[PDB]
């Protein structure tokens with residue numbers, strides 16, 4: 001038929017983050033995705049410099065209005081990510097509500113960007129007054145959430161130390177509304193070694209209500225990447241759509257695609273930088289286009305273990 | 308590569324025109340295309356309704372300011388299309404003029420959007436005070452322009468009544484600046500019927516030996532009973548791409564471009580008729596180019612139309 005995705009995320013002229021990381025991948029996979037750029041910057045804030053303007057509530061509403069007037073406010077998925085403005089996010093919520101009112105089956109894939117951890121623990125890189133809005137108004141509306149450990153901790157108030165406390169916290173989120181919760185990265189240890197970050201997933205469905213929990217030990221890459229979480233949420237949406245009731249497979253293809261892309265990025269980043277020289281943010285920009293075939297049909301280089 | 312392209316055009320949420328019609332295709336063909344969205348509307352202005360905001364001179368300058376501070380102002384191509392502000396257009400010209408100081412080998416592909424013609428009568432749909440800026444500043448800086456007939460007559464000053472006047476206009480356009488001039492559409496006579504639009508190509512280049520030569524082509528394309536939007540931008544985009552792959556063969560660049568456009572519209576029209584259903588003209592929404600569904604056609608266009616050598 002036709003799968004339309006409304007994607008309200010950031011836009012950078014140069015590089016791949018927000019809608020730049022989310023759009024191409026989703027188009028290559030056959031999704032009619034529409035990109036509302038919550039901001040337009042020359043590049044991500046991971047660089048020394050950056051310039052750009054921002055889209056305010058009034059404008060997002062103005063834009064949604066045009067879609068409504070034309071009777072084009074019927075979607076199958078809504079995708080959202082990083083937001084700094086409290087009022088902006090409220091407006092986003094009002095939009096999703098009406099989009100779900102228009103189509104009762106619409107899926108809201110929310111990546112609750114609040115902050116991350118470095119070494120021991122983290123710090124939020126978003127106004128704190130936004131946390132309440134997420135717990136109360138955003139997550140309840142969301143059907144799929146993809147937070148990292150630190151964000152899953154902030155949304156639940158419960159700190160995570162082990163695979164079991166993580167499932168407990170994921171279980172809490174589920175009761176908040178999300179039928180699919182995926183922790184995209186964590187400090188949890190792996191039997192594979194110290195060079196492995198851990199992904200955990202949890203999906204609630206009926207077949208008769210039944211759960212499906214999966215685990216994944218992904219090898220770390222010696223560098224900091226931007227736009228990877230957005231690409232994760234974006235590809236999760238895609239493969240979950242193509243393989244419903246199979247979180248295992250959907251996650252294996254998602255993480256695998258991330259693998260290939262980063263594998264190619266780090267390589268070009270090394271050859272482009274000096275051997276023995278830490279690549280710069282610019283050299284570490286996801287080699288998105290060069291990864292078209294991996295995104296289309298990613299070679300599964302990772303098996304998720306059922307919990 | 309990577310082959311870098313700066314595309315400063317319009318963006319819309321729903322549908323494909325401007326940056327939305329050019330980005331996916333070029334990304335699919337491996338081009339690292341950075342998009343500077345000049346405006347952000349809900350949809351194109353062909354729908355009953357449309358709301359949105361627009362980018363202005365300063366913001367475009369600021370966005371450019373960031374790219375420069377990070378030493379990211381080195382591109383292989385610059386792609387521009389429908390511009391609405393004499394102010395914005397001047398800022399674009401200043402930017403393209405610096406990207407060329409930064410990299411002399413840079414290629415500016417400019418679609419001089421001015422207007423078009425319907426049933427014979429042509430008129431503009433952009434501020435008239437834009438024509439001087441294009442003539443004196445934009446075209447001189449261009450390397451590949453893709454104006455339709457009307458814009459070709461406006462840029463040169465000579466109405467095009469036959470294939471002869473077209474070619475004379477192209478020579479004129481060449482003298483103005485760009486070595487590649489493609490008249491994306493014209494209602495010239497075709498030895499195949501009335502329902503055929505004509506495309507004309509002309510490229511100037513010096514070969515290995517060093518002799519400056521010119522290759523000219525002509526394509527007679529059958530008309531689809533419908534009015535689409537984004538096709539001109541898609542044409543300029545693919546031209547940028549195919550001339551890149553086949554630098555010294557304008558006949559192949561064009562054959563592929565026009566053929567890609569064919570497969571897209573062919574799939575778009577039949578998928579629009581089913582949507583509007585038997586009898587009813589397809590609405591502007593049902594006629595939105597079926598871009599993501601034509602991925603395979605963009606990557607490797609099956610050539611359905613061979614150009615005529617002039």
Ligand SMILES: Nc1ncnc2c1ncn2[C@@H]1O[C@H](COP(=O)(O)OP(=O)(O)OP(=O)(O)O)[C@@H](O)[C@H]1O
Nearest residue numbers: 113116148184185219220221223225228229232258
């Ligand atoms: N350094 C890395 N090494 C290996 N994989 C990585 C690395 N960084 C990111 N990834 C991949 O990207 C995915 C998302 O991780 P990241 O830590 O980038 O997102 P998050 O921080 O989990 O998301 P967000 O910051 O939006 O809340 C990881 O699951 C992994 O597949």
Ligand SMILES: Nc1ncnc2c1ncn2[C@@H]1O[C@H](COP(=O)(O)OP(=O)(O)OP(=O)(O)O)[C@@H](O)[C@H]1O
Nearest residue numbers: 418420423455491492529530531533538539542568
């Ligand atoms: N109705 C149509 N039937 C057949 N082909 C079309 C039709 N409309 C557009 N095309 C194709 O798209 C190309 C661009 O034509 P269009 O008339 O859409 O652009 P232009 O008007 O030439 O460009 P611009 O609007 O920027 O001045 C044509 O050369 C042709 O290949």
Ligand SMILES: Cc1ncc(COP(=O)(O)O)c(C=O)c1O
Nearest residue numbers: 352353389432536537538539540
């Ligand atoms: C006023 C106006 N400008 C520009 C366009 C864009 O056309 P193109 O993609 O062929 O340049 C349209 C399409 O309907 C239009 O109505």
Ligand SMILES: Cc1ncc(CO)c(C=O)c1O
Nearest residue numbers: 010017044045046082226227
């Ligand atoms: C504008 C903008 N949007 C989103 C992100 C998160 O990747 C960043 C990270 O630096 C950013 O700068």
Ligand SMILES: Cc1ncc(CO)c(C=O)c1O
Nearest residue numbers: 317324325348350351352353
């Ligand atoms: C905002 C906006 N920008 C560019 C174009 C050119 O197709 C249109 C056509 O309708 C538009 O609406």
Ligand SMILES: [Mg+2]
Nearest residue numbers: 116117148185
């Ligand atoms: Mg992280």
Ligand SMILES: [Mg+2]
Nearest residue numbers: 423455492539
């Ligand atoms: Mg036209």
Ligand code: NA
Nearest residue numbers: 146147148184
């Ligand atoms: Na995440």
Ligand code: NA
Nearest residue numbers: 453454455491
């Ligand atoms: Na044209």
